[PDB]
Every structure is written in structure tokens, then in C-alpha cells.
């Protein structure tokens, strides 16, 4: 059985978050929690939330043992971009993309 | 392009803009612009020989 959590429209840039998600993929729920706690990146805050929600879903909804959980899958998708104006010299107006992420974590049970 | 509602202003100078050259936005090359050889009202009737 798998459990899954998704955070959508998180206002962080996918490239930056993915770097963190990479750290916990395939890891135990237990190691993942340790890793995120001391990962010096803004993304770690968000990825932590998704991690926990999935574990919650696992235990509370899908009859999975918190002790057997691990990160079977995890991926960051691009959500819509907030296009913003950045004023520059000599009258030119640039456009900034406040990018946005869809963080997904999927948990499974280590039957071993 | 002359029946379309836009003005006849040249949208930006001919040269040194870094962009393609254009006139008014009613040009058939523009989205929203006039259409080229599109239909007009027409009389499709003719006079088939009475003997026929």
C-alpha cells in the first residue's frame, strides 16, 4: 500500500525545491525527517510538511505502520508562474517569473 | 484593412527599433487586422437561356 501527499501552488521555484526532494527520495520516513531538519535550504520547510502529511495519511487512512514507512517516490512539478515586472535602466521593463511548485511525496511500507 | 476599426498610425518607426517593420495594426498580417480576399456581398444569379 502507498500513501501520498501533495502541496500545490507553493510559491517557491521548482529547481530550488527539487534539490531538497532529491535528498530524501528512497529514504526511510525516519531518516528523511532527520535530513530535512538540518538541511540549510528554504525548501526543506515545505518538503517537510508534505512528508509529514503523507505519513499522516499512511497511518490515519491507509493502515500503514509508521515504523515501516519510507519515501517510495517524490517529485516536484512546475505550477503556474507569477509574472512580475522588474524595472530596469533606460526605460526597459523586464519580466520576473515568481515560479511555483507542486511538491509530491509518496510513502510505502518496507516489508523487511 | 480599411474597413477594420483601428487607426492608420504607424505603430513604431520604420528603422532602428530592432523589430520588424509595420504600418497600422489593421494590416491583414496582424491578428485582429483586416482580411485579404474575403467574401463580400454577392449576387450569384445569372440568366440561363429561356430555351434551355
Amino acid at each position: 500500500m502507498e500513501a501520498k501527499a501533495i502541496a500545490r501552488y507553493v510559491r517557491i521555484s521548482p529547481r530550488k525545491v527539487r534539490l531538497v526532494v532529491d535528498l530524501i527520495r528512497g529514504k526511510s520516513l525516519e531518516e528523511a525527517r532527520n535530513i530535512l531538519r538540518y538541511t540549510n535550504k528554504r525548501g526543506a520547510y515545505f518538503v517537510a510538511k508534505v512528508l509529514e502529511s503523507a505519513a499522516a495519511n499512511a497511518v490515519n487512512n491507509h493502515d500503514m505502520l509508521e515504523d515501516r514507512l519510507y519515501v517510495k517516490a517524490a517529485y516536484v512539478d512546475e505550477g503556474p508562474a507569477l509574472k512580475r515586472v522588474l524595472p530596469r535602466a533606460r526605460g526597459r521593463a523586464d519580466i520576473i517569473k515568481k515560479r511555483t511548485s507542486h511538491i509530491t511525496v509518496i510513502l510505502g511500507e518496507k516489508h523487511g | 484593412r480599411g474597413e477594420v476599426a483601428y487607426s492608420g498610425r504607424k505603430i513604431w518607426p520604420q528603422k532602428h527599433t530592432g523589430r520588424a517593420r509595420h504600418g497600422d495594426i489593421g494590416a491583414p498580417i496582424f491578428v485582429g487586422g483586416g482580411v485579404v480576399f474575403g467574401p463580400k456581398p454577392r449576387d450569384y444569379s445569372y440568366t440561363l437561356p429561356k430555351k434551355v
Partner: peptide, 19 residues
């Protein structure tokens, strides 16, 4: 070394008003 002084082909570049 060339003796017949050879004239500039290009002008000194000058700025344009920027649209």
C-alpha cells in the same frame, strides 16, 4: 608599411535615441 594613407571606411559609432 603602407605609404598612401588609407581613409576610414566606417564612421565613429554614434548612439541612437532608443525606442
Amino acid at each position: 608599411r603602407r605609404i598612401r594613407p588609407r581613409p576610414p571606411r566606417l564612421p565613429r559609432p554614434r548612439p541612437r535615441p532608443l525606442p
